[PDB]
UniProtKB/Swiss-Prot annotation:
Note describing how the cofactor binds: Binds 2 magnesium ions that constitute a dinuclear catalytic metal center. The magnesium ions are not prebound but only present for catalysis. Requires the presence of 3CDpro or 3CPro.
Domain RdRp catalytic positions: 227-342
Residues of the full protein shown: 1749 to 2209 of 2209
High-level lineage: Viruses, Riboviria, Orthornavirae, Pisuviricota, Pisoniviricetes
Cofactor(s) it depends on: Mg(2+)
Subunit field text: Interacts with Viral protein genome-linked and with protein 3CD.
Regulation: Replication or transcription is subject to high level of random mutations by the nucleotide analog ribavirin.
Originating organism: Poliovirus type 1 (strain Mahoney)
Sites where the protein binds Mg(2+) 2: 233, 328
Side of membrane Cytoplasmic, spans: 1-461
Swiss-Prot/TrEMBL catalytic activity: RNA(n) + a ribonucleoside 5'-triphosphate = RNA(n+1) + diphosphate
Protein name (record): RNA-directed RNA polymerase
Length: 461
């Protein structure tokens, strides 16, 4: 991903986009009951905590483009992945506007809280004014489609979230590229059934885990993996994607019956953005945030891993490559041990910056004991080993509970954390509940006890 140019939006006929400048995150009733070191991300150039230029920091993610064309390994990767997907008999017909808007089997309805993007954001027109979830009305939307069409600019927002001290001082805040409601709708109409087919088939065939339920899915993963596991993290995955990777994705889509609408991928690859009073053009880089983002990042990941294995290990049997991606996150396996370090090396030549799994300093062997997926470990249940617990460490949960974005969602926020934490065991869970109940706010919450969550878990399979 590389920014071609950037300039005042007025110079190209666009209005200044108003974005919030004050975080919605404030210390919660548990701020001093639990240990934590993260704070709200810098949202503006004037943030006192900054120790470097903000604008420069937030756009530096666009490391550039390392490859122009789709090489022979990539083509091979494309044929193999496309072949697997073929086995799912994915419905290739476009999805009607009604479902693309209000959802259907395998596809949730459009999120009414998220941005409507340009130009609605500049006309103060919200989604709540465009769609009727109880009416399933598509006339207003249809009229808007006909009026403003598609391929509209994406609106760049700084993500309001918790970040480490270092990242705050270095202005390393993450960005959200909200596509226009029109594009989101047109895209869900074009790829709606693909999205659904993926949501309904999380696994090693789609090579995707998007739409999955960790509590149930974790028990299916081990059975799908080959003997030897391997993994690694990416640095700035989305932004590092070169145009070739988008072209490789289009080839996959063509081969599975969607060659009919690969043009929509161009909108993602070569895209223009609106940020504050500026407008810029980017070549490459996946717009982090758009409808389809995680699924397409996941598909491209399947292409990347395959490409690197072909490039590094001629004769590798991709039919025994068992991997599951969630955007840039990935858990993979092969009957034989592979060198993540070597793969990482091959990765550089493809514009990908790969590093040791889970922030390690060196590339160590990945095992069922130390592997994580979506920040969760895998732990067989003590009483019924065939049931696998997705275990997220208490550290991130402690960090999260120390802040709130709205006092009205305190019980939902805390219940949410409880569904994640109890998997760490009863001793830990009870310690967690006790601290919560050491302050008034917590004692007033309705939280499930351990045995209740355990029973609920067993009854969910
Ligand atoms: Na782009």
């Amino acid at each position: 991903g590389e920014i071609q140019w950037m300039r005042p939006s007025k110079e190209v006929g666009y209005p200044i986009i108003n974005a919030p400048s004050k975080t919605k995150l404030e210390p919660s009733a548990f701020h001093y009951v639990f240990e934590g070191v993260k704070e709200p991300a810098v949202l503006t150039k004037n943030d006192p905590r900054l120790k470097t230029d903000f604008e420069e920091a937030i756009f530096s993610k666009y490391v550039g483009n390392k490859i122009t064309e789709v090489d022979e390994y990539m083509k091979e990767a494309v044929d193999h992945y496309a072949g697997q997907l073929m086995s799912l008999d994915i419905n290739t017909e476009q999805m009607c506007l009604e479902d693309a808007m209000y959802g259907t089997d395998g596809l949730e309805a459009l999120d009414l809280s998220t941005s409507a993007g340009y130009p609605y954001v500049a006309m103060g027109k919200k989604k709540r004014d465009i769609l009727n979830k109880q009416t399933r009305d598509t006339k207003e939307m249809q009229k808007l489609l006909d009026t403003y069409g598609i391929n509209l600019p994406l609106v760049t927002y700084v993500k309001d979230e918790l970040r480490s001290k270092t990242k705050v001082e270095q202005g390393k805040s993450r960005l959200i590229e909200a596509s226009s409601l029109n594009d989101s709708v047109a895209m869900r109409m074009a790829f709606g059934n693909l999205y659904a087919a993926f949501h309904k088939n999380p696994g090693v065939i789609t090579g995707s885990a998007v739409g999955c339920d960790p509590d149930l899915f974790w028990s299916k993963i081990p059975v799908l993996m080959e003997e030897k596991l391997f993994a690694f993290d990416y640095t700035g995955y989305d932004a590092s994607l070169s145009p070739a990777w988008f072209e490789a994705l289009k080839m996959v889509l063509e081969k599975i019956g969607f060659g009919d609408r690969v043009d929509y991928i161009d909108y993602l690859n070569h895209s223009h953005h609106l940020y504050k009073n500026k407008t810029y053009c980017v070549k490459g880089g996946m717009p982090s945030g758009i409808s389809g983002t995680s699924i397409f990042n996941s598909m491209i990941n399947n292409l990347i891993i395959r490409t690197l294995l072909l490039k590094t290990y001629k004769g590798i049997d991709l039919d025994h490559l068992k991997m599951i991606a969630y955007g840039d996150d990935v858990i993979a396996s092969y009957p034989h041990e592979v060198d993540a370090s070597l793969l990482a090396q091959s990765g550089k030549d493809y514009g990908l910056t790969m590093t040791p799994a889970d922030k390690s300093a060196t590339f160590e062997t990945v095992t069922w004991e130390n592997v994580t997926f979506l920040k969760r470990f895998f732990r067989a249940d003590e009483k019924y080993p065939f049931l696998i617990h997705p275990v997220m460490p208490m550290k991130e949960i402690h960090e999260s509970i120390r802040w709130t974005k709205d006092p009205r969602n305190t019980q939902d926020h805390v219940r949410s954390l409880c569904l994640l934490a109890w998997h760490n065991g009863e001793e830990e869970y009870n310690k967690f509940l006790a601290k919560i109940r050491s302050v008034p706010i917590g004692r007033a919450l309705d939280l499930p006890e351990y045995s209740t969550l355990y029973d609920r878990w067993l009854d969910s399979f």
